[PDB]
Design a protein around this ligand. Structure first.
Ligand SMILES: COCC1(CN(C)C(=O)c2ccc(CCn3cc(-c4ccc(-c5cc(OC)ccc5OC)nc4)nn3)cc2)CC1
Length: 269
């Protein structure tokens, strides 16, 4: 399946499980530091990669979420891509009349300026990713005319790396491939409004490689773009860079706040 047990719930009773969603190019094992900062015996299950648009991924996740937790309450948490997935699941659960009590977005932040949706921006986008690959693997990707699938675009870059002579591990290449595709899913997402409570854990800025990939991550709005879609939004400053938000020491601030939120939920069952 696509569900990873990070801490199993007791056979009966116990606390409300926390559902976490994978980041681009990684597994839900990244949430182990967070789990360390949550109360003892807090169950946590991780939702791993599935294919399609954000909406289509949520369509696969939501039935499984319901199978596991039923009417609720639902606690949905995600860093980076995982935050977008958690949000989409929040929409789906809410449409099915489920009790969603917490949505935790760990620095899942929209580009601070409008991204052009033109033919020319497709070329520029690709060029930036190629430049990222070049620096990452110290190789020269040849010039790419390129009207083909997202899969085909990343494959051109990664095929160029392997054919260059250099020997990158297969796992590193594969994570690079899925990372690219997941980020494409983010940018083609059609984000819907949500009337529930959303907690945005807000870092200071995006890391350099994110900005290299998409320049408009250089700027971010105070609300991370979510205010438009969420009338009940709580922004919690955590400082640091996007990439550091998931680890110690920054994750302590997330876990402290989240622990109090979970405490309140337990008092209403
Ligand atoms: C792992 O990737 C490796 C890769 C790229 N690279 C080298 C990186 O370093 C890299 C780049 C980017 C990211 C993603 C960070 N992120 C963005 C968001 C987000 C949330 C929401 C909306 C959003 C979007 C909307 O429609 C477009 C509308 C509203 C909306 O929000 C209110 N947009 C965006 N969440 N996390 C992570 C790492 C080589 C591939």
């Amino acid at each position: 399946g696509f569900v990873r047990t990070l801490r199993a719930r007791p056979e009966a009773g116990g606390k409300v499980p926390v559902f976490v969603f994978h980041p681009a190019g990684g597994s839900t094992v990244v949430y182990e530091p967070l789990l360390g900062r949550l109360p003892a015996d807090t169950p946590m299950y991780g939702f791993e990669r599935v294919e399609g648009s954000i909406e289509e991924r949520a369509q696969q996740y939501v039935p499984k979420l319901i199978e596991m937790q039923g009417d609720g309450p639902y606690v949905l948490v995600g860093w980076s891509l995982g935050g977008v997935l958690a949000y989409a699941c929040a929409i789906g659960l809410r449409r099915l009349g489920k009790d969603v009590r917490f949505v935790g977005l760990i620095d899942a932040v929209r580009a601070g300026e409008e991204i052009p949706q033109t033919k020319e921006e497709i070329r520029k986008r690709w060029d930036r990713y190629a430049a990222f690959a070049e620096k990452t693997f110290n190789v020269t990707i040849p010039a790419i005319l390129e009207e083909l699938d997202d899969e085909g675009q990343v494959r051109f870059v990664l095929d160029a790396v392997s054919q260059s002579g250099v020997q990158i591990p297969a796992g590193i290449i594969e994570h690079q491939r899925t990372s690219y595709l997941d980020n494409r899913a983010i940018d083609t997402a059609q984000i819907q409004p949500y009337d529930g409570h959303v907690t945005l854990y807000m870092a200071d800025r995006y890391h350099d490689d994110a900005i290299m990939f998409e320049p408009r991550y250089a700027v971010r709005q105070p609300d991370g773009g979510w205010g438009e879609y969420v009338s009940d939004l709580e922004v919690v400053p955590i400082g640091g860079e996007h990439i550091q938000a998931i680890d110690e020491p920054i994750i302590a601030k997330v876990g402290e706040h989240m622990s109090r939120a979970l405490g309140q939920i337990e008092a209403d069952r």
